[PDB]
């Protein structure tokens, strides 16, 4: 089942991050093509449960999504914690998430107040308060929009291209 | 008005430490993006350091390791600490709202007077 | 880590001309790109954001341009306080964010 969530037609905004819970029976690494395939605190059920994790970010920012890392990215959209067992699998998606003219469909937030937890999720769309006094939900001045879209288009640099990423985690 | 207003910058010999100050009104320092810019006498303007409403911090090659972005809440003042101290270090240095960027909320809008660091025996 | 080149370094201008100043980008880097202003021993005044967006307050004789690598600051009509040293500042590289050289303005008379 690991193929309704590599193979799926389209993906979540990193803020909105898409998790699978898998009840299920290398496979993967051995038909790949994948640019990242990293495993933390294992090589490749004995499993009390196991979760995917998938999304699309830029690739300069696929750096993030590993343990203790710091960024926009692993900050205020997608974090992983420190003791992290499980492995994140990325690839480059241009053929697919980018247009010509700029696909604006993914989604990235910009401002938070505090880092988020690991497997914490924030899909609110408050209007971000940059001073002492409030938005009343209006844009202006220190009243800021959370959400910035990506700019995927074709011939953009690999490091502003889209990537996606599926993350499995194992307890 | 919203303004930058800096303070304590000053004379100190090579190895010796400064503190920079910068107390902010209409911004919340903590709710923000803030930096720190220099320029040494006679050259061009380098951003030195970053640091988001998180808590994640960013440095040039140049001062990683030395320097350290800082900033209390409760007297909404950015600070910029600054250790084993050298004659290239000797700048004018500038607190800034953003990280430099071109989306509003992270250009760099709003900038301090300066404060002037020099490194000297 | 991407690198800026303005051009020109210098540069004299009588009152009511304009004035063009060129920043050149290593590799392209799409719009991500500020203009400042910046009077001898002062704070920078940021200009121009997203290569041609006016920042409130700034005057409109103030105007940006340009896209991948090649970015131009145009002042429509100089006035005699316009003197300055300008710089461009790309924001597409990792943090911190690195600027270009500076071009220097003086009023001609």
């Known amino acids: 089942p690991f193929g309704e969530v590599f193979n799926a037609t389209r993906f979540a905004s990193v803020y909105a991050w898409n998790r699978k819970r898998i009840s299920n029976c290398s496979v993967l690494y051995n038909s790949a093509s994948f640019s990242t395939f990293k495993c933390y605190g294992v090589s490749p059920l004995c499993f009390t449960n196991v979760y995917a994790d998938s999304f699309v970010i830029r690739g300069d920012e696929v750096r993030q999504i590993a343990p203790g890392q710091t960024g926009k990215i692993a900050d205020y959209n997608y974090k992983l914690p420190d003791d992290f067992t499980g492995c994140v699998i990325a690839w480059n998606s241009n053929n697919l998430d980018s247009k010509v003219g700029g696909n604006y469909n993914y989604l990235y937030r910009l401002f938070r107040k505090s880092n988020l937890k690991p497997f914490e999720r924030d899909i609110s769309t408050e209007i971000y308060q940059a001073g002492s006094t409030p938005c009343n939900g209006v844009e202006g001045f220190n009243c800021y929009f959370p959400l910035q879209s990506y700019g995927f288009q074709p011939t953009n640099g690999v490091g502003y291209q889209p990537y996606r990423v599926v993350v499995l985690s194992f307890e | 008005e919203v303004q930058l207003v800096q303070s304590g910058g000053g004379l100190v010999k090579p190895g010796g430490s400064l503190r920079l100050s910068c107390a902010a009104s209409?911004?919340?320092?903590?709710?923000?993006?803030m930096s720190w810019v220099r320029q040494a006498p006679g050259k061009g303007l380098e951003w030195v350091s970053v640091?988001?409403?998180?808590?994640?911090?960013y440095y040039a090659d140049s001062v990683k390791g030395r320097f350290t972005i800082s900033r209390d809440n409760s007297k909404n003042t950015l600070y910029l600490q600054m250790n084993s101290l050298r004659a290239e270090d000797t700048a004018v240095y500038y607190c800034?709202?953003?990280?430099?960027?071109?989306?509003?909320?992270?250009?760099?809008?709003?900038w301090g007077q300066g404060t002037l660091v020099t490194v000297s025996s | 880590d991407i690198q800026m080149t303005q051009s020109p370094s210098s540069l004299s201008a009588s009152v009511g001309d304009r004035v063009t100043i060129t920043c050149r980008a290593s590799?392209?880097?799409?719009?991500?790109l500020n203009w400042y202003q910046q009077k001898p021993g002062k704070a920078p005044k940021l200009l121009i954001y997203?290569?041609?967006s006016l920042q409130s307050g700034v005057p409109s004789r103030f105007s940006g341009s340009g896209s991948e690598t090649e970015f131009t600051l145009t002042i429509s009509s100089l006035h005699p306080d316009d003197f300055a040293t300008y710089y461009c500042?790309?924001?597409?590289?990792?943090?911190?964010?690195?600027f270009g050289q500076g071009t220097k303005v003086e009023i001609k008379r």
């Open positions: 640091i988001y409403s998180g808590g994640s911090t």
């Open positions: 590799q392209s880097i799409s719009r991500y």
């Open positions: 500042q790309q924001s597409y590289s990792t943090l911190p964010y690195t």
């Open positions: 997203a290569a041609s």
């Open positions: 800034a709202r953003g990280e430099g960027g071109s989306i509003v909320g992270v250009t760099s809008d709003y």
């Open positions: 209409g911004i919340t320092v903590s709710s923000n993006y």
